[PDB]
Design a protein around this nucleic acid. Structure first.
Lengths: 98, 84, 95, 76, 106, 97, 81, 106, 95
DNA sequence: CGTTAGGCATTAAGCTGAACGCACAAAGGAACAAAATAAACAATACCACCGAAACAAAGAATTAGAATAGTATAACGCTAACAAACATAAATTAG
DNA sequence: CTAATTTATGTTTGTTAGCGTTATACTATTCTAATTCTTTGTTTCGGTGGTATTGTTTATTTTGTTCCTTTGTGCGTTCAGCTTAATGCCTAACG
């Protein structure tokens, strides 16, 4: 009989260790591929510096972490913990995004 | 060196979205969060990348520096510290 | 013998009579249009100034204005404004 | 007891004219009568208004006699 | 015979005044001659886009004057003018009349 | 007697005040409030009437923006009303706290 | 003549919320909205006071309120540039 | 013998470089001589306030280096530096570790 | 024989050795401090420029910088910075 | 890279008459506002559930790292030549 | 209703594209290492629906309470033309 944790118990330890640690959480090569995929449509054959893709990854992680903080605020406000896409759309709507 | 790219929004994966969510303090994440967050990321990258491309195309240049990404994030009001 | 308020009040009315001959305009709406013209002028000239600084250019030419128009104005407004602008400099240079 | 400012030619002229209009227009709002009186007041000539002007001037001099050291001090 | 720079471009906004405002506005040391012509062009087109929608709003309301309620209506009803003027509020303008569908009865 | 249903008069006032462009704050109490707060920063501060009109107009705009965001947050939480937690959330998400 | 945050009356806040499209307002909203308006005017008034104090003017013109509202991201149209 | 303008004010930041950046930054035509001294003063005081809280954070963590996690901690824990740098995000900084009290178990 | 990056890297270290002698600093944190110094310089100089324009002043003196410091920096940071600044100009004028 | 000694030409402090801006006299219902109340509908407390998300182990498949070579490109310096500021005479226009 | 504000012409000058070169980081390739993404099988728990109590908002009427729009007069505030010292920018020199 193996030992199993409960849903949420491991989640708090993961929240703590990811709030403590400062690294990037999405890999650099799919972000390079996605940035070069998107920037085709504005001008083809662009060279991306590694520092430019790293700066885009830093600002991307910062924007998504702030948006998920506001999503958790809105989901807590509606007496939920499981965030939902309407919370994302609401937190974008209040923020002045759309 | 000619190549076209496709379907790179699946490269930002679902247990790599869950880490960005659990950094922000989220305790439970629903199933339909992922495509919406990828779309949010897509429109944000499209705005900031279009700004960086106009910045580098004004300068008669062919590559994208990090300084132009910093200026593009400055014009959206999200200033980045650490690149000059 | 009061000093005169330098404003864009006549030219908004000229544009209005070009585009809508029958309808009149208020005075406070003319003030709103004056404030809007000054706001958009500050936005475009500020982006042109910081673009000339980022490229170490001491001269703001029409390229910086065109890039700033493509920066600020979203959607089809950008390319419509650029077509209007290039029509204006081709008119100004052909004469 | 605070001292009130001397009534100006229009206020003096309205005190008696305002009542005249109220008796003829006792259901008319003061807000509207005040507007018609101003319209009518602007149509009086200086010679006709002069009598009103001199009385306000006399009320001001007489008011100054009762309260010579009085000063107009508005609240900012 | 000499013709003005505002009608050299075939416009209404004065090229000389926007040139003077670019000079004394302290944006650069020099300014190109195509810059005020381009800027007057985009400005004239922009208030043309405002006044056309304002006139259609005022003619749609069976009025003959442009009051700022018409300017607020013409700006808030649009999509790509709403992104340009999203933070700016309008004096004596009111709001765009829209009520959430859950507040309304069935 | 025939009293209206609760909210039907509120709906008619919603459509009336949204169709209206009038100032919903009386000028004298707002003048008193502005000259009551601004004494704390500096004394002997008279105001132009256009300045207090601008302050009333901008506070009107800021409050109707705050209240449409508040009603968004309240509808989101399955509530027709407004509670002050909605105002707290709408000020927090906008980044004003 | 003191305590002028009750100058912003309770019907004049119900009208502000009816303009915003609000069907019901609870009774605990008026004091919170009064505090919100108070801190908003505190910010804008402090900025306009620093403006008119830098120019050594004892009065607060309209342009100072425009410039104070511009810096918080809420530009006023109509009161001159 | 002549002494530098940075230590004329008794500071570390160079008065000449901030004077040159105010000149070539195109902010006005002229600039007063008290302007770079005042600006170097407020700048030096500002990074003194940053580095003091950063050193107290790094000494509080039993580290001997200032990594940007310490800068993000020193900025986000403060009140009146958080209003100055609220929109700015920090490279490799992470977040301020704080968890909402309803997510935590009893 | 590369051209040199003009930056504030030495003076942040001088301030750090004045305020904290034992702890060292990274290189990327020094770049962050350089970017922060340039950001705050742009904020203060932009507010000083627009204040000199709003009063039709062609000269930015220390009054505009003091007013801009009181504008941007919130709380006790404002008066602390003003006291530091006035200490600096009294030092610079006494010598 | 940074500081310092003399012109000079621009610029803010100083000053006064003049023009602006605001409060306030009466009026007297109109329009607003506070207060008390009936009750009706909205917030909320509680309960069931079920399917949806978390947890785990395995493997796959992907990224990381490194050496390296080409290699487009970007960042250095001369140079012309071109475009814009500046000094000085109309004109139309407009508050 | 005529001063004033834009427009045109020639001159200087200082900015910038063209050119050359070269360095330099970028892109691609091919290996191992490692690490982490995706599949599949538990498992357990939170969003959502449904009902009942309650608590509090609304709409209304009564009774105060204020307001509002009108012109002239008093007083404090600002502003613009004119004086005048302050000062900052340029050049030459030095370190």
């Amino acid at each position: 009989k193996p030992h199993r944790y409960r849903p949420g118990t491991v989640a708090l330890r993961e929240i703590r260790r990811y709030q403590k640690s400062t690294e990037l959480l999405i890999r650099k090569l799919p972000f390079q591929r996605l940035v070069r995929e998107i920037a085709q449509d504005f001008k083809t054959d662009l060279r991306f510096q590694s520092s430019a893709v790293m700066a885009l990854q830093e600002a991307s992680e910062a924007y998504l972490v702030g948006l998920f903080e506001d999503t958790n605020l809105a989901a807590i406000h509606a007496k939920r913990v499981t965030i939902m896409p309407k919370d994302i759309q609401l937190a974008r709507r209040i923020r002045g995004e759309r | 060196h000619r190549k076209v790219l496709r379907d790179n929004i699946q490269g930002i994966t679902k247990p790599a979205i869950r880490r960005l969510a659990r950094r922000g303090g989220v305790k439970r994440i629903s199933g339909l969060i992922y495509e919406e967050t990828r779309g949010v990321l897509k429109v944000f990258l499209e705005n900031v990348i279009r700004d960086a491309v106009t910045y580098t195309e004004h300068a008669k240049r062919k590559t994208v520096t990090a300084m132009d990404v910093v200026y593009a994030l400055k014009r959206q009001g999200r200033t980045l510290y650490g690149f000059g | 013998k009061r000093s005169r308020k330098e404003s864009y009040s006549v030219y908004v009315y000229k544009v209005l009579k070009q585009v809508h001959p029958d309808t009149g305009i208020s005075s406070k709406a003319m003030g709103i249009m004056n404030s809007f013209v000054n706001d958009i002028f500050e936005r475009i000239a500020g982006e042109a100034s910081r673009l000339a600084h980022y490229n170490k250019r001491s001269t703001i030419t029409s390229r910086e204005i065109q890039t700033a128009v493509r920066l600020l104005l979203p959607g089809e407004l950008a390319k419509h404004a650029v077509s209007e602008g290039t029509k204006a400099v081709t008119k100004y240079t052909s004469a | 007891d605070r001292v009130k400012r001397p009534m100006n030619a229009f206020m003096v002229w309205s005190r008696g004219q305002r009542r005249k209009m109220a008796q003829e227009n006792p259901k008319m709002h003061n807000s509207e009568i005040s507007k018609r009186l101003g319209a009518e007041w602007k149509l009086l000539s200086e010679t006709e208004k002069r009598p009103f002007i001199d009385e306000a001037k006399r009320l001001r001099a007489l008011h100054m006699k009762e309260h010579p050291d009085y000063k107009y001090r508005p609240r900012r | 015979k000499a013709k003005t720079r505002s009608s050299r471009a075939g416009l209404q906004f004065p090229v000389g005044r926007v040139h003077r405002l670019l000079r004394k506005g302290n944006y650069s040391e020099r300014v190109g001659a195509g810059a005020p012509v381009y800027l007057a062009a985009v400005l004239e087109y922009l208030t043309a886009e405002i006044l056309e929608l304002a006139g259609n709003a005022a003619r749609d309301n069976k009025k003959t004057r442009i009051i700022p309620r018409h300017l607020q209506l013409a700006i808030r009803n649009d999509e790509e003018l709403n992104k340009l003027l999203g933070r700016v509020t309008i004096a004596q303008g009111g709001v765009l009349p829209n009520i959430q569908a859950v507040l309304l009865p069935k």
